[PDB]
């Protein structure tokens, strides 16, 4: 906890259903990002304790919590990611220029931060490009620990079975957002249509210009049986070695 007075909210970076996000300064010497919980959405004492678990986790690929203000409206001081969200990043200028190596690179970093969460016996719950923050030099970091039905695994959306293996399903979906440059999953399908199709065995096909080897990894993240989806340790390694072990004959195309 810190004196709210030492915080300064300069620019607003965006607004969400449960609060807002602001660039700003701390002690006048430190550029931070300040998240605000818009009152009445979450019981203070409640959010209070979930937050203590945000302190324990410390990784290079997890947006780092710096400080917190306990008084409503609640302030969450974290580290500033200049390039904003990955979805914004992908949908914006750079999407045109990003190719498979950059994308596969960004995926590996996320798999890295998630492999750490995996080790910590923790679960994210809401893994999607909107919750990945980008910094300088394509540094991606997992943020905002938990409706996005299209990013959610069947057993989680229906029976509330949220596990690190339901994050693996979400990751496979994230992979399509990268290969598509920010496009929405299951294009042309509304949540209910998605929910019903996936139950009957439907999975998204190979995005244009995407290699089958990369699509196969998606489908492994999309296995009906949770314990049969690979770990983030496996995905991390696979992605890091991609262009040497898996796609050494890779050649740049028009988009990928």
């Amino acid at each position: 906890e810190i004196p709210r007075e030492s915080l300064r909210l300069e620019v607003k970076l965006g607004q969400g259903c449960f609060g807002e996000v602001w660039m700003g300064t701390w002690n006048g010497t430190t550029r931070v990002a300040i998240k605000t919980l818009k009152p009445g959405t979450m019981s203070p004492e409640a959010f209070l304790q979930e937050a203590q678990v945000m302190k324990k986790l410390r990784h290079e690929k997890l947006v780092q919590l710096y400080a917190v203000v306990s008084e409503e409206p609640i302030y969450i001081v974290t580290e500033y990611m200049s390039k904003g969200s990955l979805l914004d990043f992908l949908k914006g200028e750079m999407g045109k220029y990003l190719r498979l190596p950059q994308l596969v690179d960004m995926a590996a970093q996320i798999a890295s931060g998630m492999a750490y969460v995996e080790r910590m016996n923790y679960v994210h719950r809401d893994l999607r490009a909107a919750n990945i923050l980008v910094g300088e030099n394509l540094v991606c970091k997992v943020a905002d620990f938990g409706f996005p039905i299209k990013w959610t695994a069947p057993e989680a959306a229906l029976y509330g079975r949220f596990t690190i293996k339901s994050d693996v399903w979400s990751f496979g979906i994230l992979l399509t957002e990268l290969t598509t440059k920010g496009r929405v999953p299951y294009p042309g399908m509304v949540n209910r249509e998605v929910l019903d199709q996936v139950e009957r065995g439907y999975r998204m096909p190979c995005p244009p210009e995407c290699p089958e080897s990369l699509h196969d990894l998606m489908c492994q993240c999309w296995r009906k049986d949770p314990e049969e989806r690979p770990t983030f340790e496996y995905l991390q390694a696979f992605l890091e070695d991609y262009f040497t072990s898996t796609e050494p004959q890779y050649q740049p195309g028009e988009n990928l």
Binding site: L13, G14, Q15, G16, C17, F18, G19, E20, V21, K35, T36, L37, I76, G84, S85, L87, D88, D126, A130, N131, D144
Partner: peptide, 4 residues
């Protein structure tokens, strides 16, 4: 969800 606090910021997208």
């Amino acid at each position: 969800x606090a910021x997208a």
